């Protein structure tokens, strides 16, 4: 054995400090393993405290550690398995196959901490992903190589949205994907595992076109923090070394922020505003910066974000808010109105919604939608008390058009056939631009309002008009 043997000195909470013997001190961010009857606890060295005492964060349960129990050093940051043999595994924070397909047949391991690609490396891009979801396509399209971000509330139908997105985007995407789950419920986990086994994305006879890194919220406070990192490294291997495009997806990334709050507190750093870690900015930065479209390849993150108590002024959603390219804020109110997807049309902004980028026609149609809806929102107060009994002829037309546009957003989804039962609908990008254009022009202002509820394109609006006619 190595003369690198440490004896645990304090099993505190997750913080467990080890007291290595003379000159050999494992460097900050390396990974220590303590052989245990459980298996291997991996502890990440996180401070050096002087006098040959390192202070490490546990990544597995700390119960049963016996003070003074010998600690071996791996010698580098938690080293995952990476490969094309990582497709169709479910690997956990410490990178062990937790799906019991037997040993991951990896050729390489890589560190979980690797510096983001330099300023020189960055390369601008702007290509338009076709979500196939009406609200998304028209009013804030997503872009390939971007950092798409599914910001939304607590239980505002986040799961439904994510499920639809996986169905569309994943199948469409050419490259592999890594679906990485940071701290989401194991009920949700099993559903996702099952769902993509059914959809054949994970084909355990064939070769899966996706990998999984599920760390779930029953895992020790430390592990939740660096589980996100574990996932990043699988994506990096694909992006760089294997040169293919990727489509990393992480869920819910607020949980990454939240996780960081916990291990900050335990490490004993004086808590900052609204209890977030002092390292709040830089921790967001390390995750976000790493995932970007280099000249090597392209990785398009789609990150769910959970807005605690539906207040997006809270420091944790707000910190995340900056980094992501194409925000879509799913709001509770819009959900309550019955509009599914619940994306709030007046709050979704994409930075690649620019007139040149999306084309002049797309731009004009979408600009007109935004103004029409926004006016309606402004008028909402007047309508509430005074009534529509002093709203002008123009205003009455604006209310009517806006109400029609407002409910034109709802579209039944393919995974909402068990949540609804109206067959899912995916409209083309071109079709969405056209269909909304017609509505705005007032070409279908003769159609009754309920025929815009849960329909596809304009053709469907006409079809529902006939249905009502009967």
């Amino acid at each position: 054995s190595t003369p690198i043997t440490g004896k645990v000195t304090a099993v505190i909470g997750a913080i467990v400090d080890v007291h290595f013997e003379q000159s050999e001190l494992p460097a900050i961010l390396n990974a220590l393993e303590i052989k245990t009857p459980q298996g291997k606890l991996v502890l990440e060295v996180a401070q050096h405290l002087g006098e040959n005492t390192v202070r490490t964060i546990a990544m597995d349960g700390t119960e049963g550690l016996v003070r003074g129990e010998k600690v071996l050093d791996t010698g580098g940051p938690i080293s995952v398995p990476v490969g094309r043999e990582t497709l169709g595994r479910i690997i956990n924070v410490i990178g062990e196959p937790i799906d019991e397909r037997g040993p991951i047949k990896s050729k390489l391991r890589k560190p979980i901490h690797a510096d983001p690609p330099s300023f020189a490396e960055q390369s601008t891009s702007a290509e338009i992903l076709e979500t196939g979801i009406k609200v998304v396509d028209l009013l804030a399209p997503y872009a390939r190589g971007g950092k798409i971000g599914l910001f939304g509330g607590a239980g505002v139908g986040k799961t439904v949205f994510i499920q639809e997105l996986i169905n569309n985007i994943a199948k469409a995407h050419g490259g592999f994907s890594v679906f990485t789950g940071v701290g989401e419920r194991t009920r949700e986990g099993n559903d996702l595992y099952r769902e993509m086994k059914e959809t054949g994305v994970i084909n355990l006879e064939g070769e899966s076109k996706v990998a999984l890194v599920f760390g779930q919220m029953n895992e020790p406070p430390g592990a939740r923090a660096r589980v996100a990192l574990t996932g990043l490294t699988i994506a990096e291997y694909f992006r760089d070394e294997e040169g293919q495009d990727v489509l990393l997806f992480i869920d819910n990334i607020f949980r990454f922020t939240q996780a960081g709050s916990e291990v900050s507190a335990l490490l004993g750093r004086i808590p900052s505003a609204v209890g977030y870690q002092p390292t709040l900015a830089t921790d967001m930065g390390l995750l976000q910066e790493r995932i970007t479209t280099t000249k090597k390849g392209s990785v398009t993150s789609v990150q769910a974000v959970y807005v605690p108590a539906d207040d997006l002024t809270d420091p944790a959603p707000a910190t995340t808010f900056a980094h992501l390219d194409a925000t879509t804020v799913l709001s509770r109110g819009i959900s309550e109105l019955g509009i599914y997807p619940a994306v709030d049309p007046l709050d979704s902004k994409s930075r690649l919604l620019d007139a040149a980028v999306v084309g002049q026609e797309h731009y004009d149609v979408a600009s007109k939608v935004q103004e029409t809806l926004q006016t309606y929102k402004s008028l909402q107060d007047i309508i509430a008390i005074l009534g529509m009994d002093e709203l002008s002829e123009q205003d009455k037309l604006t209310v009517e058009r806006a109400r029609k546009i407002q409910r034109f957003l709802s579209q039944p989804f393919a995974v909402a056939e068990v949540f609804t039962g109206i067959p899912g609908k995916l409209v083309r990008l071109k079709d969405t631009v056209a269909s909304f254009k017609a509505v705005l022009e007032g070409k279908y202002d003769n159609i009754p309002e309920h025929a815009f509820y849960m329909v596809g394109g304009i053709e469907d609006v006409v079809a529902k008009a006939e249905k009502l006619a009967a």
């Binding site: 004086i270 808590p271 505003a273 609204v274 209890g275």
Partner: protein, 53 residues
């Protein structure tokens, strides 16, 4: 006679409404101001408690 009385009443009524609303603005303004102060203090105490340890 009626139409004039009606519109005259509506003017009178909406005028009294504006006054009543003003009073509510002032009352809730004081509540707002206090509430704002309280949040700053309460938050501050939490930070202090942490540092003190």
């Amino acid at each position: 006679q009626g139409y004039a009385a009606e519109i005259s009443a509506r003017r009178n009524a909406m005028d009294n409404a504006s006054k009543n609303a003003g009073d509510m603005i002032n009352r809730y303004s004081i509540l707002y101001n206090r509430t704002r102060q309280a949040v700053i203090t309460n938050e501050l105490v939490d930070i202090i408690t942490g540092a003190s340890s």
